[PDB]
Amino acid sequence: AQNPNCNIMIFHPTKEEFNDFDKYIAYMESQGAHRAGLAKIIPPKEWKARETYDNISEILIATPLQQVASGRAGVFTQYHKKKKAMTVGEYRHLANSKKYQTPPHQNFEDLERKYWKNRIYNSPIYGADISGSLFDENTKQWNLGHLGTIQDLLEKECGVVIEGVNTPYLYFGMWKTTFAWHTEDMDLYSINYLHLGEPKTWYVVPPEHGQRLERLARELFPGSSRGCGAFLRHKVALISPTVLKENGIPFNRITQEAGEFMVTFPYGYHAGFNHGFNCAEAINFATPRWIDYGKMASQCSCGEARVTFSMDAFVRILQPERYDLWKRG
Ligand SMILES: [NH3+]NC(=O)[C@H](NC(=O)c1ccc(Br)cc1)c1nn[nH]n1
Ligand SMILES: [Cl-]
Ligand code: NI
Ligand SMILES: [Zn+2]
């Protein structure tokens, strides 16, 4: 068994190995990468996502989100307060202001300690799920706007044409902006490229242990769990690494820097925070190995979750028994 301890693996593909995206995902899994739930991919030195980032200030963040926290420092929920629209240039200046700028710190570990100590006492502003791409059209390798779509994958595997598209999203972050514990919609894969700016720290639970995190979440957020059998689909719950270790939950952590890809694997729970102003791009994707995960993926039928993008057709084909219930909610 490859990677039996479920460590996060880091890959350094050559420019030749960087041509065939599907092949390299398969290669990483042959080495046991998926057992961690998260892998880092450092692109070859010959590669660039685009020429510069000098001309992105005019992008519009139509609905910036202020992340207000409730709870204790290591166990808390956050809700998203909608703010007036602002451009990326305005957002960058806001992130670097005294109220929101990264504090002095000596290393990633020091900043991590500051994050979990002080996160709940602030409310950073986040730009998320903005349809778009910053990859140059001339970038042919690992361009997140040019992967095979999930709709085509299901057709190839199961023989069924379905409606729907599969396009990338942009994220604008600042210090303490937070993504709560979650798996992807339908427990899909995701791939995230950090285009620009300060790092993002990730936490991840191995897919083979995801149910352990679910059980701890039910214990730590008991009202939330009574309201929905899959409330982590709401993407509002945070649990610190200290509390995870206290409860024996298997997990790993890693910091992603500009110019690095991260891939999350099916049913790999992950959470994290941004260190300062940055810009990332991400999209979900599927492989033949995902189909079995899609069939078994939990759903939220209580109304809250909504979604990154339409799962209707995936639920309809892969989970026909659930379709009606999930539909009504
Ligand atoms: N799969 N998504 C991610 O892992 C994560 N975004 C979220 O979890 C998220 C939560 C609530 C809302 Br609303 C919108 C998005 C991310 N990726 N790069 N930056 N953040
Ligand atoms: Cl701080
Ligand atoms: Ni995610
Ligand atoms: Zn729900």
Side-chain angles (χ1 to χ4, degrees):
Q2 297 282 284
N3 191 20
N5 285 353
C6 300
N7 297 321
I8 298 171
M9 299 178 70
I10 303 161
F11 293 89
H12 285 84
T14 60
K15 57 184 192 314
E16 291 82 13
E17 293 164 344
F18 220 48
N19 282 321
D20 189 327
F21 185 78
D22 287 1
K23 186 168 165 170
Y24 201 74
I25 299 296
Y27 167 72
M28 287 192 300
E29 295 186 343
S30 79
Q31 303 300 290
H34 56 294
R35 295 192 64 170
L38 177 74
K40 173 178 292 194
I41 305 91
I42 297 175
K45 71 195 194 275
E46 295 81 10
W47 184 86
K48 280 181 174 161
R50 65 176 301 115
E51 292 299 318
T52 78
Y53 293 92
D54 280 358
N55 318 310
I56 68 170
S57 288
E58 309 303 314
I59 293 169
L60 192 68
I61 303 168
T63 309
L65 299 172
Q66 178 173 52
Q67 304 185 297
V68 179
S70 306
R72 68 182 171 105
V75 179
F76 67 87
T77 61
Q78 59 181 11
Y79 80 87
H80 287 170
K81 204 190 161 199
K82 297 176 196 274
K83 315 296 289 189
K84 310 308 291 255
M86 75 180 63
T87 63
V88 165
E90 291 166 341
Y91 179 88
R92 180 178 58 231
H93 187 271
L94 187 63
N96 294 333
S97 69
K98 291 203 176 151
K99 179 176 175 66
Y100 296 108
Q101 176 66 290
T102 313
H105 60 284
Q106 58 184 24
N107 54 45
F108 294 158
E109 186 190 53
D110 187 29
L111 193 65
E112 174 181 45
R113 286 190 302 265
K114 286 174 161 51
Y115 171 85
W116 289 106
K117 184 163 182 312
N118 302 297
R119 160 64 185 97
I120 62 165
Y121 302 118
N122 299 90
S123 303
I125 294 157
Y126 180 46
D129 294 341
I130 301 167
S131 283
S133 182
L134 296 181
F135 283 88
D136 183 336
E137 56 181 303
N138 299 325
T139 296
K140 305 306 188 218
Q141 301 168 314
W142 286 55
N143 183 323
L144 299 189
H146 293 165
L147 310 180
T149 75
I150 295 151
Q151 291 82 12
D152 284 352
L153 182 279
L154 267 183
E155 183 182 336
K156 282 184 306 283
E157 294 302 297
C158 305
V160 58
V161 189
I162 50 150
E163 75 282 0
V165 293
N166 180 199
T167 59
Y169 297 89
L170 301 177
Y171 301 81
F172 297 90
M174 66 173 57
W175 166 232
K176 284 179 178 171
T177 59
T178 299
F179 54 107
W181 281 105
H182 68 285
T183 63
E184 302 300 303
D185 297 326
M186 289 300 275
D187 293 346
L188 282 156
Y189 297 71
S190 71
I191 181 165
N192 186 116
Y193 183 69
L194 192 46
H195 279 284
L196 179 76
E198 308 301 319
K200 177 188 269 76
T201 290
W202 301 67
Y203 306 93
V204 61
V205 173
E208 69 203 66
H209 301 302
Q211 284 201 151
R212 292 190 191 209
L213 181 79
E214 294 170 352
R215 286 197 209 91
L216 178 63
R218 302 203 296 276
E219 297 162 349
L220 289 178
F221 303 94
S224 300
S225 177
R226 279 194 292 283
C228 180
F231 78 97
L232 290 179
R233 295 273 179 218
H234 305 176
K235 310 209 294 182
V236 298
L238 277 300
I239 306 165
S240 73
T242 293
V243 175
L244 288 183
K245 286 278 178 229
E246 283 174 346
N247 286 278
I249 307 296
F251 77 98
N252 287 111
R253 73 194 86 195
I254 192 166
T255 299
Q256 173 197 22
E257 299 187 73
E260 306 186 332
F261 290 90
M262 307 295 302
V263 165
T264 82
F265 294 86
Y267 195 59
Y269 276 100
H270 55 284
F273 63 92
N274 291 311
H275 293 206
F277 169 74
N278 59 18
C279 171
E281 177 171 347
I283 193 178
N284 295 123
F285 69 93
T287 72
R289 202 179 63 86
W290 161 79
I291 291 281
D292 282 343
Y293 287 90
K295 295 167 162 166
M296 310 187 331
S298 71
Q299 307 304 343
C300 159
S301 298
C302 85
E304 304 285 311
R306 281 133 204 255
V307 52
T308 305
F309 75 105
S310 193
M311 303 287 121
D312 189 291
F314 311 151
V315 179
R316 197 168 70 245
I317 304 313
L318 295 184
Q319 306 178 321
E321 177 171 15
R322 281 135 174 260
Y323 188 58
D324 277 350
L325 260 76
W326 173 78
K327 182 181 179 180
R328 295 176 289 186

